Amino acid sequence: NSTATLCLGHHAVPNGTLVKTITDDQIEVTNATELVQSSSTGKICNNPHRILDGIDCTLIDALLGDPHCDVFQNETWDLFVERSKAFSNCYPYDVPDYASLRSLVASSGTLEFITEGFTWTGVTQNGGSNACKRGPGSGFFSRLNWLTKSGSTYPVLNVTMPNNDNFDKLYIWGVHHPSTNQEQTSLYVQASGRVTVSTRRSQQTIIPNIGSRPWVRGLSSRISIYWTIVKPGDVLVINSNGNLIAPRGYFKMRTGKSSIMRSDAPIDTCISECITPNGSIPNDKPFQNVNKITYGACPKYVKQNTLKLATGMRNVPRGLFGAIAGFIENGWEGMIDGWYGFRWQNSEGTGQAADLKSTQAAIDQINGILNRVINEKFHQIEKEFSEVEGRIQDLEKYVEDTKIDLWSYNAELLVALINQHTIDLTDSEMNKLFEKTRRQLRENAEDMGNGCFKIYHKCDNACIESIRNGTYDHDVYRDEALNNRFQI
Amino acid sequence: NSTATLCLGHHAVPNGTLVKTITDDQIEVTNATELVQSSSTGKICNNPHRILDGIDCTLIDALLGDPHCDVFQNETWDLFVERSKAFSNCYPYDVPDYASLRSLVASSGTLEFITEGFTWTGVTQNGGSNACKRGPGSGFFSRLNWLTKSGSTYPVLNVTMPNNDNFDKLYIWGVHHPSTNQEQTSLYVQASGRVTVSTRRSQQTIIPNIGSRPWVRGLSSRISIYWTIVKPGDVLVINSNGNLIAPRGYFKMRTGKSSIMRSDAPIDTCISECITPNGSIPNDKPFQNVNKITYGACPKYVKQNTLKLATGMRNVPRGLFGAIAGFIENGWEGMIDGWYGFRWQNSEGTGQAADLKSTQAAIDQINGILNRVINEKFHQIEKEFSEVEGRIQDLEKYVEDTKIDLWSYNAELLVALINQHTIDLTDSEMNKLFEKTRRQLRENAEDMGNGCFKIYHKCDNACIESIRNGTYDHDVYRDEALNNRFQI
Amino acid sequence: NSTATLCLGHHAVPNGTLVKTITDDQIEVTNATELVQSSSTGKICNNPHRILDGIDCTLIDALLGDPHCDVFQNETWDLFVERSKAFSNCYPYDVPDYASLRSLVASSGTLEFITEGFTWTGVTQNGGSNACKRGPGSGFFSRLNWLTKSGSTYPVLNVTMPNNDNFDKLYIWGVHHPSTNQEQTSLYVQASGRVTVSTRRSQQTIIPNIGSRPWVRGLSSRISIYWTIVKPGDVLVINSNGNLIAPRGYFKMRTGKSSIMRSDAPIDTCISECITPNGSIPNDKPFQNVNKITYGACPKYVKQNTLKLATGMRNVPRGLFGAIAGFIENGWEGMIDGWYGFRWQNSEGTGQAADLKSTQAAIDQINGILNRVINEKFHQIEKEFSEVEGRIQDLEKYVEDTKIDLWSYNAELLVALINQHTIDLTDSEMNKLFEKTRRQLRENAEDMGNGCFKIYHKCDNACIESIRNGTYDHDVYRDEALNNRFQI
Ligand SMILES: *[C@@H]1O[C@H](CO)[C@@H](O[C@@H]2O[C@H](CO)[C@@H](O[C@@H]3O[C@H](CO[C@H]4O[C@H](CO)[C@@H](O)[C@H](O)[C@@H]4O)[C@@H](O)[C@H](O[C@H]4O[C@H](CO)[C@@H](O)[C@H](O)[C@@H]4O)[C@@H]3O)[C@H](O)[C@H]2NC(C)=O)[C@H](O)[C@H]1NC(C)=O
Ligand SMILES: *[C@@H]1O[C@H](CO)[C@@H](O[C@@H]2O[C@H](CO)[C@@H](O[C@@H]3O[C@H](CO[C@H]4O[C@H](CO)[C@@H](O)[C@H](O)[C@@H]4O)[C@@H](O)[C@H](O[C@H]4O[C@H](CO)[C@@H](O)[C@H](O)[C@@H]4O)[C@@H]3O)[C@H](O)[C@H]2NC(C)=O)[C@H](O)[C@H]1NC(C)=O
Ligand SMILES: *[C@@H]1O[C@H](CO)[C@@H](O[C@@H]2O[C@H](CO)[C@@H](O[C@@H]3O[C@H](CO[C@H]4O[C@H](CO)[C@@H](O)[C@H](O)[C@@H]4O)[C@@H](O)[C@H](O[C@H]4O[C@H](CO)[C@@H](O)[C@H](O)[C@@H]4O)[C@@H]3O)[C@H](O)[C@H]2NC(C)=O)[C@H](O)[C@H]1NC(C)=O
Ligand SMILES: *[C@@H]1O[C@H](CO)[C@@H](O[C@@H]2O[C@H](CO)[C@@H](O[C@@H]3O[C@H](CO)[C@@H](O)[C@H](O)[C@@H]3O)[C@H](O)[C@H]2NC(C)=O)[C@H](O)[C@H]1NC(C)=O
Ligand SMILES: *[C@@H]1O[C@H](CO)[C@@H](O[C@@H]2O[C@H](CO)[C@@H](O[C@@H]3O[C@H](CO)[C@@H](O)[C@H](O)[C@@H]3O)[C@H](O)[C@H]2NC(C)=O)[C@H](O)[C@H]1NC(C)=O
Ligand SMILES: *[C@@H]1O[C@H](CO)[C@@H](O[C@@H]2O[C@H](CO)[C@@H](O[C@@H]3O[C@H](CO)[C@@H](O)[C@H](O)[C@@H]3O)[C@H](O)[C@H]2NC(C)=O)[C@H](O)[C@H]1NC(C)=O
Ligand SMILES: *[C@@H]1O[C@H](CO)[C@@H](O[C@@H]2O[C@H](CO)[C@@H](O)[C@H](O)[C@H]2NC(C)=O)[C@H](O)[C@H]1NC(C)=O
Ligand SMILES: *[C@@H]1O[C@H](CO)[C@@H](O[C@@H]2O[C@H](CO)[C@@H](O)[C@H](O)[C@H]2NC(C)=O)[C@H](O)[C@H]1NC(C)=O
Ligand SMILES: *[C@@H]1O[C@H](CO)[C@@H](O[C@@H]2O[C@H](CO)[C@@H](O)[C@H](O)[C@H]2NC(C)=O)[C@H](O)[C@H]1NC(C)=O
Ligand SMILES: *[C@@H]1O[C@H](CO)[C@@H](O[C@@H]2O[C@H](CO)[C@@H](O)[C@H](O)[C@H]2NC(C)=O)[C@H](O)[C@H]1NC(C)=O
Ligand SMILES: *[C@@H]1O[C@H](CO)[C@@H](O[C@@H]2O[C@H](CO)[C@@H](O)[C@H](O)[C@H]2NC(C)=O)[C@H](O)[C@H]1NC(C)=O
Ligand SMILES: *[C@@H]1O[C@H](CO)[C@@H](O[C@@H]2O[C@H](CO)[C@@H](O)[C@H](O)[C@H]2NC(C)=O)[C@H](O)[C@H]1NC(C)=O
Ligand SMILES: *[C@@H]1O[C@H](CO)[C@@H](O)[C@H](O)[C@H]1NC(C)=O
Ligand SMILES: *[C@@H]1O[C@H](CO)[C@@H](O)[C@H](O)[C@H]1NC(C)=O
Ligand SMILES: *[C@@H]1O[C@H](CO)[C@@H](O)[C@H](O)[C@H]1NC(C)=O
């Protein structure tokens, strides 16, 4: 043997995975990873977020103090979960802007209630109904005070309560809507009631409407629920000639991370940052396809059910078994110890060795990409709706749909673009190792065109190792090689 | 002739088109295609979407049953088109939340009306006005029932209508606003009217306001229009001591693809998926600059009036007419049969041949890109407004403007980035064919530096063809070539 | 000296700056520039936008004509600035949809007021209060007319005012809310008041609510403020049996660039296109981290406090002082005159020269990128809120947060992607100059593997200059070089 072959090549695998680039619709790589979380455990983890299971109670029924919700008094949450099974079992009521009251109480994160010393002169307090049983007898909302006539008169109620504290007070109050003119006069002497609740800049002016509503728990009557916020330095005044459902005091308002979610998923003893109505999901992936409704440190919702990011190079796996070949022809499935390396034929037979510098350079770039590819949101907007509403709901749905489409586009582009760069940097390290070998060899070898060098001199395993190391002296073999090349 | 020249080159065209990349503000390519649809036919195609021309009717006037809109009874649509010419010709009315009622009826896609057997005891039904002529005599809205006194009394009306069906019922009802106290007492005996319309969870409480409004079709009086949805299992109760404009029954509510658009474009017998107020547009392009208002499978609206995607490579078109040159100097306008190929000078004169593998590889990548570059939206938000409104309209306009700017950015970046990759992959196939030729030739040729090889041996057309094929044996010419190179 | 060394290399700097690419977390470049404006001067520049300092006045108090705001009569602005110090000093009032009235007046950009000849028959005009002093005596809002009884009667007021102009008229009017039934009867004879204000399609129906509000400037009474727009051809009718706070005329409505901002930043005599509440900012950078609230030609708000765009190439700065080396080993800190160039050792010693073509090509591409990297928004949505409101505020905040996150993502990706292309194009120009030199030299030099050529012939400074120029004849040295290469 007067010559040697030194082939440059890269690893390949028997299986392999198809991914998208900018340049190729489908290209096989050695390895890929999923960027879309498509699976939930089905359970909401009660750590690290404080989960409050509403059970049979909406947040509003906990707020008002519906007797079967009295267990939620002074409750606090990071996430209130309202169940499908929830029912109201007190006086039948409406909240004109239900969604807003639900939202601002949810965001406050507390039903911390402070009873205040309201003095109601010339009226009988603590009115009850058989539609709102507490214990054996008739009762009412724990946080509201049903005022009616004393003897045969109902005076103009005119009370004030100053806010001398350094936080916002939330006052929940109501207006009674009697079923008949008979019912109006019996409870509140005047034929037409009135509830004015004001601060220095704000006022609410509500007139009760007499009439039969649908029978609920015995009653065709209704309470309409209102709220007033009073800031530090400001004051509350309540003025009524009838139909006032009075506050007992205020809810202490807070700022921070608290929200509310509709889910029937059971609460479990586990740890997960990200909550969806389907259950907790892991947040290791940048994107998720489980639910557009999320709470906590979550992947971004996208329309795609899968996105495959390349974590490896292009995968390139008839009687001629002796010959060796390089990267121009194909990859090497035998190459265990590295991504790139050498195969040679010489005096001492066939050998193979990985190159760790080229291998590590490729791995370090891909790991750096993965590091950057792998935000916490708390109270957001509602994304599902049980009633048709028109304009506001149309805008809420259009905002979320706009968002999903823009992030879905961002996710599609990012994966295609990074996959393009991963193919390119992995091809680049192969070419760099071939060029680096070419430059060492000088005039002692020529390019066989298959990603291998024909070395035109005796090059034993020690000689080959010197090429694989930095240290090969072209000069010591130059005479021998030039003679082999340019004569025979 | 002891030598040959083999030049590697690519095609060019006399004309050419400027495009944007990341790296170059303007770069000439052989071919480009438009990604922004900037043109409409001016006509809405009535296929495949069911178009309902409102003609002289708004959707609300079709809903209420304004006599000149009676042709729209039980009508269904995918897209209702409201015309500028539309007029109301019945009782003068307002709809407090007009936009929401218009939106939820539009989205429902039907005026399927089911008359119900409401019994109105102690009142005269079917009230009419000269402001709402049907035939020769006075009339009213087809879907509403104007109730007034019978003899000299108007009782407390207290009727119920249960929803035992498995769909949502939409009830349209109204409150009459008389011009004078005289007019109030004459129609409805009580000096002050009342309309309470409720379900188990919802109630609406409306008090009529007596006063002169502007004279419209004889009248300073007005009807205010309200709606109530009642779900399966729930019930409607209507309670009034006066001024009730009664429903005759319900509209059957549906979910799906239906919407409404303001346009004066004529309806034509043609096929187009995408509808704009300017007329139908083709949807072959990813983007459009015609209108931010669209219906159906449409290109995304962007601010740009043109975006040019490269579908070809860089376009590179003094006494020395004999000599040939390669891709380093320029492209070849003569190259008819391919994108890349060969030019040679030898014993048998000057020849030229295209390389189909390199040509097809470039074409297949570009066609794959185009395949991915070439969403259906139905009911959205309003994007134009005839009245100033403040907060809600500001948010609707800000949402749409936010969207347009983000998609305009996405379109600008995508075209620049894909154009960068198209230039790079087209340059790459040229370099790959030059390197592939270099490797075949081994020590029989050297690089002339103009993208041509000087072959240092007699290489006839058969020899050249063997280089253009896979099959060239450097060994059979090596002796001859080394002698030609390293002596003379 | 029978040989020469010609090294190809690029410049480097002692310092250098770390930037992000797609491929590298951190990579050192010779130069970089900031894309995020993080600094304000602290002052709003009064050029080129017309700034109106509200001083002690909100826009609404300027509109209504609160005496201490009478200096703002007929005022116009591009940007109204409301100060924290602003106070109201007239009749205590609420505006049911304050934010909308504030928004549509701000967007109109004018308080141009036209007094109209309203005739109020059977009522005493120009009612005043000690809570609204103008001069020594009691007064009222300049733009409103407080109507009360004349003698002992208050008739049904029924006035009309047609719009025969070709612009929209904005009418500001109000309803008085007395503290007691005593106060209602004394001012307006009827026990229950009424204000109906209508156009042909629109009507507002307001009933006053009697009751004590919190004491403000002597009074527990309140005025509620309403607005009506009347288009050309349409007409206004006002109908009241009491409590009407009458308009004196209309505000002329305009379309265009006008908005409003909350700021305590002082107004200065300087020029800046972009205004934030923190003060004016320069708009040379694409992005800014100062405030999501902006007015004018502004950078886009992003979460990042810094983004570094590469404006230069990769920065690559033991007894062996004689030897020279090329770009494979490192960059040259000595290279003053260019980005790329040549170093050589020959008969006449060591030399160095820059290549201007390669240098200029790299600079022109980078300057073109910077040109494209370096939008005006006027009236937008509110982005900060002094009160909790629920649903609408949740949507306004969610829209802005959605926007910030999408632009922050766009800015992160764009910088990483352009930096990737800047590294690649700067590496490319180096490789192109090395390949261009290689092709000139033909068989007279071989690649030393350090980005230098060993020229195997005597190559003096004139010979080297001919290589640096286009004009080097390999043939004249070929014999000498082949002899030097393939013998000794
Ligand atoms: C305005 O118009 C509305 C609607 O028409 C009226 O509201 C209805 O009012 C009646 C009561 O006046 C409700 O009818 C039923 O009342 C029963 C009371 O029980 C006693 O009376 C019945 C007489 O038939 C006896 O059979 C019974 O033994 C008792 O002696 C309830 O028992 C009924 O309950 C309902 O729910 C249960 C659930 O288990 C069912 O089993 C029953 O079948 C039934 O569905 C029922 O409530 C009726 O519900 C009201 N309807 C609505 C829609 O609200 C107003 O009264 C009227 N107002 C005025 C002033 O006239
Ligand atoms: C509260 O205040 C409002 C506004 O001031 C009043 O509303 C106006 O009411 C009057 C009717 O009382 C309207 O005036 C006109 O009525 C005409 C009726 O026709 C007969 O009477 C006139 C007497 O001048 C004769 O000329 C005519 O031959 C008939 O005998 C209409 O014909 C008028 O029509 C209008 O439109 C036509 C379109 O073709 C034009 O040709 C006319 O020029 C005219 O513009 C007109 O309607 C008046 O329109 C009402 N104005 C508004 C703005 O609504 C309320 O009456 C008042 N209420 C109370 C209780 O006092
Ligand atoms: C419904 O309920 C509300 C709230 O309870 C009542 O509103 C309060 O009304 C009273 C007046 O009736 C307000 O009290 C004070 O009135 C003073 C008037 O000055 C004279 O009277 C006092 C008698 O104590 C003398 O001391 C004084 O010398 C005068 O002769 C004001 O001077 C008070 O001013 C306030 O602000 C100044 C700021 O400098 C402070 O210095 C004072 O300490 C004080 O804070 C004060 O206004 C009281 O403010 C009202 N409260 C609210 C919350 O509105 C309604 O009167 C009641 N309605 C009915 C019909 O009963
Ligand atoms: C195919 O590609 C995937 C994704 O790059 C490779 O999986 C990743 O492998 C690395 C190294 O084994 C894992 O890193 C380790 O993670 C654990 C847990 O955080 C940590 O304790 C260790 O210190 C280390 O950082 C990484 O988690 C893992 N990623 C995933 C998503 O599974 C995989 O190795 C590749 N497969 C083959 C056969 O090469
Ligand atoms: C310049 O580039 C454009 C865009 O790539 C080329 O136009 C495209 O040409 C192809 C092949 O001729 C067309 O494909 C055909 O489309 C029809 C209709 O769908 C189909 O029936 C055929 O089977 C085939 O797929 C393609 O539609 C057409 N695109 C456009 C937008 O016109 C064009 O060929 C290039 N010009 C030159 C001179 O090379
Ligand atoms: C490092 O990179 C920065 C950014 O590319 C270079 O700063 C830029 O330098 C150019 C040329 O000196 C400046 O252009 C000039 O701008 C002025 C003002 O508009 C104009 O009158 C001139 O005709 C010219 O166009 C450019 O403004 C400047 N940009 C910034 C942001 O400072 C800088 O030269 C580089 N540093 C080194 C040491 O190479
Ligand atoms: C809910 O929390 C509030 C405090 O936020 C409790 O109010 C205190 O009640 C005790 C009763 O002995 C009083 O001594 C305190 O003065 C009250 N605090 C304040 C700030 O007024 C309230 O008792 C709690 N209720 C429940 C059911 O836990
Ligand atoms: C998470 O829950 C949502 C809502 O329950 C699921 O969305 C529904 O999925 C069903 C079953 O595939 C479809 O029939 C409906 O069209 C979906 N409705 C809506 C409103 O989205 C979602 O598929 C669940 N995801 C996972 C992974 O469990
Ligand atoms: C509109 O459609 C409804 C059905 O959705 C029609 O209602 C039916 O009318 C016929 C009249 O003979 C009755 O026999 C049916 O009982 C009605 N159906 C229901 C479900 O109640 C209605 O007639 C249609 N009207 C028009 C003008 O086409
Ligand atoms: C589609 O229709 C819209 C609305 O009519 C056009 O937009 C207007 O275009 C005119 C004429 O160029 C301008 O004067 C207006 O400023 C535009 N108004 C609005 C509200 O956009 C649009 O140009 C039409 N496009 C096509 C291609 O016909
Ligand atoms: C505010 O501007 C309006 C014009 O927009 C002024 O109204 C004019 O007042 C003069 C007074 O002599 C009359 O002659 C004109 O007829 C009025 N114009 C119109 C269109 O009616 C108004 O005077 C200005 N007020 C202030 C304080 O500057
Ligand atoms: C511009 O002004 C805003 C609002 O005053 C500043 O934002 C606040 O910054 C302070 C101090 O860093 C923080 O404590 C607050 O959390 C921020 N509040 C809000 C609502 O953003 C902003 O930092 C200012 N920027 C500059 C450059 O002056
Ligand atoms: C082979 O790759 C495919 C890619 O879709 C994957 O689903 C499968 O699990 C892999 N199988 C093995 C045995 O590695
Ligand atoms: C030449 O190219 C330009 C590009 O703007 C195009 O507008 C024109 O139609 C072309 N002309 C011919 C004859 O191909
Ligand atoms: C050196 O570069 C750093 C980059 O962070 C910069 O902050 C510093 O001002 C520079 N110093 C000099 C002397 O150029």
JSON list of N, CA and C in Angstrom, two decimals, chain C residues 75-100:
[
{"chain": "C", "resi": 75, "resn": "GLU", "atom": "N", "xyz": [-60.75, 77.22, 22.39]},
{"chain": "C", "resi": 75, "resn": "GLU", "atom": "CA", "xyz": [-59.36, 76.72, 22.30]},
{"chain": "C", "resi": 75, "resn": "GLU", "atom": "C", "xyz": [-59.31, 75.57, 21.29]},
{"chain": "C", "resi": 76, "resn": "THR", "atom": "N", "xyz": [-58.14, 75.36, 20.70]},
{"chain": "C", "resi": 76, "resn": "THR", "atom": "CA", "xyz": [-57.83, 74.25, 19.77]},
{"chain": "C", "resi": 76, "resn": "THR", "atom": "C", "xyz": [-56.50, 73.62, 20.19]},
{"chain": "C", "resi": 77, "resn": "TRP", "atom": "N", "xyz": [-56.33, 72.33, 19.89]},
{"chain": "C", "resi": 77, "resn": "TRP", "atom": "CA", "xyz": [-55.10, 71.57, 20.23]},
{"chain": "C", "resi": 77, "resn": "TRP", "atom": "C", "xyz": [-54.87, 70.45, 19.22]},
{"chain": "C", "resi": 78, "resn": "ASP", "atom": "N", "xyz": [-53.61, 70.06, 19.06]},
{"chain": "C", "resi": 78, "resn": "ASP", "atom": "CA", "xyz": [-53.19, 68.71, 18.60]},
{"chain": "C", "resi": 78, "resn": "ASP", "atom": "C", "xyz": [-53.15, 67.80, 19.83]},
{"chain": "C", "resi": 79, "resn": "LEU", "atom": "N", "xyz": [-52.54, 68.24, 20.95]},
{"chain": "C", "resi": 79, "resn": "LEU", "atom": "CA", "xyz": [-52.50, 67.44, 22.21]},
{"chain": "C", "resi": 79, "resn": "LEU", "atom": "C", "xyz": [-52.88, 68.31, 23.41]},
{"chain": "C", "resi": 80, "resn": "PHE", "atom": "N", "xyz": [-54.03, 68.01, 24.01]},
{"chain": "C", "resi": 80, "resn": "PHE", "atom": "CA", "xyz": [-54.45, 68.52, 25.33]},
{"chain": "C", "resi": 80, "resn": "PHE", "atom": "C", "xyz": [-53.71, 67.72, 26.42]},
{"chain": "C", "resi": 81, "resn": "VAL", "atom": "N", "xyz": [-52.97, 68.40, 27.30]},
{"chain": "C", "resi": 81, "resn": "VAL", "atom": "CA", "xyz": [-52.32, 67.73, 28.48]},
{"chain": "C", "resi": 81, "resn": "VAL", "atom": "C", "xyz": [-53.12, 68.09, 29.74]},
{"chain": "C", "resi": 82, "resn": "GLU", "atom": "N", "xyz": [-53.69, 67.07, 30.37]},
{"chain": "C", "resi": 82, "resn": "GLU", "atom": "CA", "xyz": [-54.38, 67.19, 31.68]},
{"chain": "C", "resi": 82, "resn": "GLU", "atom": "C", "xyz": [-53.34, 66.93, 32.76]},
{"chain": "C", "resi": 83, "resn": "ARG", "atom": "N", "xyz": [-53.31, 67.80, 33.77]},
{"chain": "C", "resi": 83, "resn": "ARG", "atom": "CA", "xyz": [-52.37, 67.75, 34.91]},
{"chain": "C", "resi": 83, "resn": "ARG", "atom": "C", "xyz": [-53.05, 67.07, 36.09]},
{"chain": "C", "resi": 84, "resn": "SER", "atom": "N", "xyz": [-52.26, 66.45, 36.97]},
{"chain": "C", "resi": 84, "resn": "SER", "atom": "CA", "xyz": [-52.67, 65.88, 38.28]},
{"chain": "C", "resi": 84, "resn": "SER", "atom": "C", "xyz": [-53.30, 66.95, 39.18]},
{"chain": "C", "resi": 85, "resn": "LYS", "atom": "N", "xyz": [-52.83, 68.20, 39.09]},
{"chain": "C", "resi": 85, "resn": "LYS", "atom": "CA", "xyz": [-53.26, 69.32, 39.98]},
{"chain": "C", "resi": 85, "resn": "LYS", "atom": "C", "xyz": [-54.67, 69.81, 39.62]},
{"chain": "C", "resi": 86, "resn": "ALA", "atom": "N", "xyz": [-55.21, 69.44, 38.45]},
{"chain": "C", "resi": 86, "resn": "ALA", "atom": "CA", "xyz": [-56.50, 69.96, 37.93]},
{"chain": "C", "resi": 86, "resn": "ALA", "atom": "C", "xyz": [-57.58, 69.74, 38.99]},
{"chain": "C", "resi": 87, "resn": "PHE", "atom": "N", "xyz": [-58.45, 70.74, 39.17]},
{"chain": "C", "resi": 87, "resn": "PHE", "atom": "CA", "xyz": [-59.62, 70.70, 40.09]},
{"chain": "C", "resi": 87, "resn": "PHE", "atom": "C", "xyz": [-60.83, 71.28, 39.36]},
{"chain": "C", "resi": 88, "resn": "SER", "atom": "N", "xyz": [-62.01, 70.86, 39.78]},
{"chain": "C", "resi": 88, "resn": "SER", "atom": "CA", "xyz": [-63.32, 71.42, 39.37]},
{"chain": "C", "resi": 88, "resn": "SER", "atom": "C", "xyz": [-63.76, 72.41, 40.46]},
{"chain": "C", "resi": 89, "resn": "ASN", "atom": "N", "xyz": [-64.31, 73.58, 40.09]},
{"chain": "C", "resi": 89, "resn": "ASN", "atom": "CA", "xyz": [-64.70, 74.63, 41.06]},
{"chain": "C", "resi": 89, "resn": "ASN", "atom": "C", "xyz": [-66.03, 75.26, 40.63]},
{"chain": "C", "resi": 90, "resn": "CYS", "atom": "N", "xyz": [-66.98, 74.44, 40.19]},
{"chain": "C", "resi": 90, "resn": "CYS", "atom": "CA", "xyz": [-68.32, 74.89, 39.75]},
{"chain": "C", "resi": 90, "resn": "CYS", "atom": "C", "xyz": [-69.37, 73.98, 40.41]},
{"chain": "C", "resi": 91, "resn": "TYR", "atom": "N", "xyz": [-70.54, 73.82, 39.80]},
{"chain": "C", "resi": 91, "resn": "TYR", "atom": "CA", "xyz": [-71.62, 72.96, 40.35]},
{"chain": "C", "resi": 91, "resn": "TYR", "atom": "C", "xyz": [-71.10, 71.52, 40.33]},
{"chain": "C", "resi": 92, "resn": "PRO", "atom": "N", "xyz": [-71.24, 70.73, 41.43]},
{"chain": "C", "resi": 92, "resn": "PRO", "atom": "CA", "xyz": [-70.79, 69.34, 41.41]},
{"chain": "C", "resi": 92, "resn": "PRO", "atom": "C", "xyz": [-71.61, 68.53, 40.38]},
{"chain": "C", "resi": 93, "resn": "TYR", "atom": "N", "xyz": [-70.91, 67.78, 39.53]},
{"chain": "C", "resi": 93, "resn": "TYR", "atom": "CA", "xyz": [-71.51, 67.11, 38.35]},
{"chain": "C", "resi": 93, "resn": "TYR", "atom": "C", "xyz": [-70.92, 65.70, 38.19]},
{"chain": "C", "resi": 94, "resn": "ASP", "atom": "N", "xyz": [-71.66, 64.84, 37.50]},
{"chain": "C", "resi": 94, "resn": "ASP", "atom": "CA", "xyz": [-71.16, 63.57, 36.92]},
{"chain": "C", "resi": 94, "resn": "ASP", "atom": "C", "xyz": [-71.47, 63.56, 35.42]},
{"chain": "C", "resi": 95, "resn": "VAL", "atom": "N", "xyz": [-70.69, 62.79, 34.66]},
{"chain": "C", "resi": 95, "resn": "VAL", "atom": "CA", "xyz": [-70.92, 62.48, 33.23]},
{"chain": "C", "resi": 95, "resn": "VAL", "atom": "C", "xyz": [-71.03, 60.97, 33.12]},
{"chain": "C", "resi": 96, "resn": "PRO", "atom": "N", "xyz": [-72.26, 60.40, 33.07]},
{"chain": "C", "resi": 96, "resn": "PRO", "atom": "CA", "xyz": [-72.46, 58.95, 32.98]},
{"chain": "C", "resi": 96, "resn": "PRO", "atom": "C", "xyz": [-71.43, 58.15, 32.16]},
{"chain": "C", "resi": 97, "resn": "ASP", "atom": "N", "xyz": [-71.04, 58.65, 30.98]},
{"chain": "C", "resi": 97, "resn": "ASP", "atom": "CA", "xyz": [-69.99, 58.02, 30.12]},
{"chain": "C", "resi": 97, "resn": "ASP", "atom": "C", "xyz": [-68.87, 59.05, 29.92]},
{"chain": "C", "resi": 98, "resn": "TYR", "atom": "N", "xyz": [-68.34, 59.57, 31.03]},
{"chain": "C", "resi": 98, "resn": "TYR", "atom": "CA", "xyz": [-67.27, 60.60, 31.08]},
{"chain": "C", "resi": 98, "resn": "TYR", "atom": "C", "xyz": [-66.18, 60.31, 30.03]},
{"chain": "C", "resi": 99, "resn": "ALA", "atom": "N", "xyz": [-65.64, 59.09, 30.01]},
{"chain": "C", "resi": 99, "resn": "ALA", "atom": "CA", "xyz": [-64.49, 58.69, 29.16]},
{"chain": "C", "resi": 99, "resn": "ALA", "atom": "C", "xyz": [-64.82, 58.93, 27.68]},
{"chain": "C", "resi": 100, "resn": "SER", "atom": "N", "xyz": [-66.03, 58.59, 27.23]},
{"chain": "C", "resi": 100, "resn": "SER", "atom": "CA", "xyz": [-66.46, 58.75, 25.82]},
{"chain": "C", "resi": 100, "resn": "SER", "atom": "C", "xyz": [-66.56, 60.24, 25.48]}
]
